[model samples]
Target: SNTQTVLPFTGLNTPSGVAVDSAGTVYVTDHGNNRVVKLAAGSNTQTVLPFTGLNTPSGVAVDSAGTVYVTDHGNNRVVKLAAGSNTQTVLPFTGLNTPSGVAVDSAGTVYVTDHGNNRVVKLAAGSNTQTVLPFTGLNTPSGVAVDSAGTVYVTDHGNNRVVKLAAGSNTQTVLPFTGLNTPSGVAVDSAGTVYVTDHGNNRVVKLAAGSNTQTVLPFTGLNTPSGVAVDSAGTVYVTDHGNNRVVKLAA
Candidate 1:
């Protein structure tokens, strides 16, 4: 079977990113709309979060603690909304150039793809300090995802490859993937399976755990598939960018 749209495009202007929290709530960055929308667990309706000051938010991540993190690309800052709070606070950092993608590990660590700086920045939990990851000349790194084991994954857009930073390791290696055309969003499932949204190809690909080859998901007519995530149930969620909506390929 093919992937199916979660809902019709209802005023979603060029949505670009998506994530699911511990409670099954689906969060999506309505990029052109300049806001974030959430689909409640098992509901079809989407609600815009209370943030009127957002400027082209390109990515979103939800921590296990239910805190929401967003990369406001236009503002060149990452902001967070504490659990159950409407007030948004900016993460302390400087020289953020178009933070396009974000991810939060179970240990409260936050990672943002500082696209403008050509690298990724990791912020330790409860600490204001940041550690730049081992990335340079990354042609517009777009998405970052951390698995349960702490292994990190990032999409190197211009290089047409996804790179991996093993847990606790400083060196980055290219994943065994090819034919990726301007890949952007990336996510790792609990089993360490990798999912990447190939922007130029308008498709999504999956590399199963420990598998050498990738599987092209049965998603037809996907216009610029970008942001991606895997839920606890193994369901894959994708921000179908060109279509201006989210879609799901059942596990």
Candidate 2:
């Protein structure tokens, strides 16, 4: 039995993305405000990072080294903020058509959902070069997440399906889980279960690993739920975009 706690943070306008770092810091993309803000572990106060070049930032992710990556959707670029510094570097990559979602694997590879182009891209660690994975069935992909085994999961928003790409392969398979409507954000738990924000359905659902059955979480009072992440302890954090708040559901 998990209780829901609406975090004390407020005053956000259409906040879209949320990510938790290794240190338990929560980073949120203040989309309407055009910036990213961080909430330290166990604290409600927010510290806005001092980097520029933000335009309707949407997705946010932090690498193991504490480096933060944000998808500047309105600017059609990805910006990287180095760890422990205010320096902001625009990653030198081409053909970034409205990048929306971002995720970093253990090897430091960054994967982004190029929503405007209907494809996903991979940027090698420590390099601005890119390799667009050969995906043929993507339709306005939004949120992306990578598991410990390197498998990539993406919410194909336009197509209303969640697709998976095996590690080191370009083949895409649509997960058979049903009961999704306008799915947006996606995440994988330690046991490989998939958690997705079924935006149109106004709820979050989980699909057990290697099973097609769908389990809608008991917390059905969400409003336009978007990005979702599960911590090591299995606690689920979701961005209640419509209501302008974030909720943490105990594991």
Candidate 3:
């Protein structure tokens, strides 16, 4: 039907990332604004977190406990926004160069894409140490997402493909799909289907579980869609960076 609903919030400047917590709340990184903003589910009210130290924040994800993780791109580090508090702290691990995408698994481990370094690093929960994921074919990775089984999906932007890393293995398999034009953001649903924002194409694509076939969602009127997230009901939330809006599409 080519129909869609635009989220009521506006005045966002280059909102690049969008994440929804379990409670239906939407968290967005106003990249050009250098801040993260929260929108309560089903309401137009917005609450901008009162934390500082953000420099060109890019990707954002929320854990089960509501803790927010952000890739402070310009700052070259990942920062956490503790649940129930506005305090922001840089994760202790180092060796990051232009960190961009971020995601957290159910086990509380954090994964970040070291964009400039062409690698991804995982920070274990409750530990100050870090381990680099073994897959090395990454080229300018941008967005990342982890599924229920702990399988990690990353959008290798420069390579124009999405790669998957199994739960306990380091082998990287470029998904057997095609028609990816500068894939930027990725999110997997409960059924293991992958949704990606094809930035260059100005559209979003869906890859069914266990198949390489691609289905382009009927998302029209989009401009430079960057980040995407799917909630429990399969509704997709996308950050339209060029248009300065967040769009919600029906499942």
Compare the candidates by TM-score and give the number of the best one.
3
Query: Per-residue alpha-carbon lDDT of model 2 for 1-251, expressed as tens digits?
Result: 35788776767887888888777788888888898988887897888887796898989988789899999999999888988887898877688888999999999898999999999998888787798887787899999999999999999999889999898786889998686887988988879999998988888888988897888776647898888888777777788889888877877
Computed on alpha carbons, the lDDT of every model, listed in order, comes to 0.87, 0.86, 0.88
Q: Clashes per prediction?
A: 0, 0, 0
Q: Considering lDDT, which of the candidate structures 2 and 3 is the better prediction for this target?
A: 3
Better of 1 and 2 by lDDT: 1
Off by over 4 Å in 2: none
Which RMSD values do the candidates have, in order? Answer: 1.4, 1.3, 1.2
Q: Sorted by lDDT, highest first, which candidate order results? A: 3, 1, 2
- Residue pairs with colliding backbones in model 2 are none
Please provide, for model 1 over 103-137, each residue's C-alpha lDDT reduced to its tens digit, 9 standing for 90 to 100. 99889899999997889998887688888888655
Best model per lDDT: 3
Task: Give candidate 3 regions above 4 Å deviation.
Answer: none
For 78-159, candidate 3 gives per-residue lDDT tens digits of 8888888867878876989988889999999999989899988898988888988887778989889899999899999999
- TM for candidate 3 is 0.97
